[PDB]
């Protein structure tokens, strides 16, 4: 589960 | 489950 | 579970 | 579980 | 479990 | 468990 | 969530880019 | 969450970029 | 969370970048 | 959390970068 | 947590960087 | 935690860096 | 095989070159 | 085979070149 | 095989080059 | 095989080069 | 095989080079 | 095999080079 709030940057998730 | 609120950036998810 | 609030930087998560 | 608040830097997590 | 508050630097965690 | 508050430096943790 | 009076400029690139530039080769 | 009067400039790149530049080779 | 009157400039790069620059080779 | 009147300049790089620069080789 | 009137300049690099620079080789 | 009126300049490097510089080889 | 290249310049030359200012 | 190339310039030349300003 | 290259310059030359200012 | 290269300069030359100012 | 290279300079030359100012 | 290289300079030359100022 990935939760993001007010993301102005770059988010990278690898599973 | 991916939840995004107010995303101004770049979000990358790989599963 | 990944939770991010007000992320202005770069977040990288590898599992 | 990864929790980030007000992240202006670069966060790298490898598991 | 990793908790970060007001991170302006670079945080690296390897497990 | 790693807890960081007001981190302006570089923190490296290896386990 | 309340947000107001904010200007956002976002640019995202996911594609390979190849650029070649030549300026010159003039005889005077 | 309340946010106001903020300007954001975000640039993100995930793609390989190759750039070649040549300036010169002029005869005077 | 209350945030106001803040300017943010964020640049993130995850891609390999190759740059070649040549300036010169002029005959006077 | 209350934050105000702050300017942030953040640059993050995770990609290999190769740069070549040549200046010169002029005949006068 | 209360924070105000602060300027932050953060630069982070995690990638290998190779730089080559040549200046000269001019005949006068 | 209360913090105010502070300027922070942080630089962090985790990547190998190779730099080559040549200046000279001019004939006068 | 006789080849001659002659270039003569007597005029002031001003050159300005800008390459860049790209956002990715 | 006789080839002659002659270029003569006596006029002031001003050149401005801009390449870039692209957003991706 | 006779080849002659001659370049003569008598004019003031001003050159400005900028390469960079790219944000990634 | 006779080759001659001659370059003559009599004009003041001003060159400015900037390479960099890139943010990653 | 006869080769001659001649370069003559009589003009003041000013060169400024900047390489760097990159943020990573 | 006869090769001649001649370079003659009579003009004042000023060269400034800066390489660095990079933040990592």
Residue numbers in the entry:
A (entry chain O), B (entry chain R), C (entry chain L), D (entry chain I), E (entry chain F), F (entry chain C): 16 to 30
G (entry chain P), H (entry chain M), I (entry chain J), J (entry chain G), K (entry chain D), L (entry chain A): 10 to 37
M (entry chain N), N (entry chain Q), O (entry chain K), P (entry chain H), Q (entry chain E), R (entry chain B): 14 to 37
From the paper:
Overproduction and aggregation of IAPP leads to amyloid deposition in the islets of Langerhans, a pathological hallmark of type-2 diabetes. Although the precise link between IAPP aggregation and disease remains uncertain, IAPP aggregates have been shown to be toxic in cell-based assays, and genetic and animal studies implicate islet amyloid in the progressive loss of pancreatic β-cell function. Over 40 different proteins, with diverse native structures or in many cases intrinsic disorder, form amyloid associated with human disease, yet all amyloid fibrils share a common cross-β architecture consisting of a continuous intermolecular β-sheet supported by networks of zipper and ladder-like interactions. Amyloid fibrils have a similar cross-β architecture, but fibrils formed by a single protein sequence can have diverse structures, varying with time, self-assembly conditions, and sequence modifications.
Cryo-EM was performed on fibrils assembled from 30 μM IAPP in the same buffer used for kinetic assays (160 mM ammonium acetate, pH 7.4, 1% v/v DMSO), in the absence (4 replicates) or presence (2 replicates each) of 50 μM YX-I-1, canagliflozin, or doxazosin. The majority of fibrils formed in the control (69%) and doxazosin-treated (72%) samples were classified into three related fibril structures (named LL, LLU, and LLUU, respectively), which have a shared structural core consisting of a pair of protofilaments related by a 21-screw symmetry. Each protofilament is formed from a single stack of L-shaped IAPP subunits, with straight β-strand segments encompassing 13ANFLVHSSNNF23 and 25AILSSTNVGSNTY37-NH2, hinging on a turn at Gly24. By contrast, the control and doxazosin-treated samples consisted of L-fold (62% or 72%, respectively), U-fold (34% or 28%), and S-fold (4% or 0%) subunits.
